[PDB]
Amino acid sequence: GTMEELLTSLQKKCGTECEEAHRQLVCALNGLAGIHIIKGEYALAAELYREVLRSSEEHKGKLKTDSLQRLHATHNLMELLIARHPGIPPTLRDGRLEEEAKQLREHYMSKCNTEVAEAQQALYPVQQTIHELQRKIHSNSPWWLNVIHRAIEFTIDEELVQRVRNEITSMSEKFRDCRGLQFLLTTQMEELNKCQKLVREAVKNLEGPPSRNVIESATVCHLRPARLPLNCCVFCKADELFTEYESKLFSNTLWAISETERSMKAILSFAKSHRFDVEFVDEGSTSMDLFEAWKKEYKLLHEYWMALRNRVSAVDELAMATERLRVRDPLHIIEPHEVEQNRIKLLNDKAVATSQLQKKLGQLLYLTNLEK
Numbered sequence: 001g002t003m004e005e006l007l008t009s010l011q012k013k014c015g016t017e018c019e020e021a022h023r024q025l026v027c028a029l030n031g032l033a034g035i036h037i038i039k040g041e042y043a044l045a046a047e048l049y050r051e052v053l054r055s056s057e058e059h060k061g062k063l064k065t066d067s068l069q070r071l072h073a074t075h076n077l078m079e080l081l082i083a084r085h086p087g088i089p090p091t092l093r094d095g096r097l098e099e100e101a102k103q104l105r106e107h108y109m110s111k112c113n114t115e116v117a118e119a120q121q122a123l124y125p126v127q128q129t130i131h132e133l134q135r136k137i138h139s140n141s142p143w144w145l146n147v148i149h150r151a152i153e154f155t156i157d158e159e160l161v162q163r164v165r166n167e168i169t170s171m172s173e174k175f176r177d178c179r180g181l182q183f184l185l186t187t188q189m190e191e192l193n194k195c196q197k198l199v200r201e202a203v204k205n206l207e208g209p210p211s212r213n214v215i216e217s218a219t220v221c222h223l224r225p226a227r228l229p230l231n232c233c234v235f236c237k238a239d240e241l242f243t244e245y246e247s248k249l250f251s252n253t254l255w256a257i258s259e260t261e262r263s264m265k266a267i268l269s270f271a272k273s274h275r276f277d278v279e280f281v282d283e284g285s286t287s288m289d290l291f292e293a294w295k296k297e298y299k300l301l302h303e304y305w306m307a308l309r310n311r312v313s314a315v316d317e318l319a320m321a322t323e324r325l326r327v328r329d330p331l332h333i334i335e336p337h338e339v340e341q342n343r344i345k346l347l348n349d350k351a352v353a354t355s356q357l358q359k360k361l362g363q364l365l366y367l368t369n370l371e372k
């Protein structure tokens with residue numbers, strides 16, 4: 001029913017509004033706490049972190065609180081109780097902080113870790129297909145080489161060249177005759193095979209939880225660069241190889257067929273028209289299945305590359321979530337004399353979010369009370 005759908009839609013939109021207003025409130029409280037630590041007053045900051053955790057717990061039923069904001073409060077409160085103690089009063093909640101932080105980190109990382117596992121597993125069926133298909137194709141004397149050869153022999157090569165050219169116009173200037181096509185296709189197949197070996201090796205060498213030199217290199221390269229993105233990290237270098245292989249597996253202006261595959265399709269079409277031995281047609285058909293498998297493998301290899309890249313991005317997101325506001329010395333950075341300007345902006349942000357949250361929770365309570 002569209003009415004139960006309407007009530008659900010109004011409740012979801014309203015709940016999201018409560019969630020955003022609470023996110024803005026908690027964000028302002030954490031910022032104000034970060035200033036108190038910069039000033040030196042560790043106790044006043046601890047009260048704000050404790051309020052962040054208290055408010056999130058109170059509203060956990062009605063709305064969700066960003067795990068990173070809760071982790072920001074939990075971790076920085078733990079930092080004060082491990083070192084700055086006994087300046088901060090103890091509470092019966094202090095013992096739970098370590099496990100809560102670990103749970104928040106685990107919950108946040110769960111998606112990117114599952115996506116690494118799923119992207120890795122997704123590659124096995126297509127790779128087994130590629131191994132099965134390559135067993136059925138002759139490497140030394142391929143079907144298309146023997147089709148070209150017999151076409152030149154019986155002087156039906158002109159019809160073949162015209163049929164290959166018509167399929168392209170639907171690097172044709174790179175070959176004049178059938179022998180020119182033969183050598184051009186040899187080079188293009190060798191190039192594809194070299195592109196495949198390299199892209200697979202590039203992916204293989206990005207697997208596994210990466211080292212600190214890799215995390216930091218990717219961060220200064222494309223996550224948080226000093227100015228413009230560097231495009232020099234192991235992931236960016238691998239993507240340059242993917243682009244190179246894509247330009248040969250597909251055509252420019254990943255969906256449209258390459259000129260190599262188009263030529264191969266036309267040679268197979270010519271072989272069928274001229275009623276060549278079933279062996280040539282079968283091998284040609286297997287080559288078409290192989291081009292299909294290579295395109296599927298490309299997409300799955302790039303998704304696996306993406307999953308591994310995203311895991312590095314997520315680890316940086318975790319590190320940045322716990323990072324506090326620090327006054328710049330000659331993001332979480334404040335100018336030498338903008339400390340008061342930041343405090344004022346945060347105090348007004350808290351005031352507006354407190355007001356918006358009260359209004360939105362009242363409307364949410366109304367929508368909830370219709371079902372009784």
Ligand SMILES: [Zn+2]
Pocket residue numbers: 218221222231232233234235236
């Ligand atoms: Zn990079």
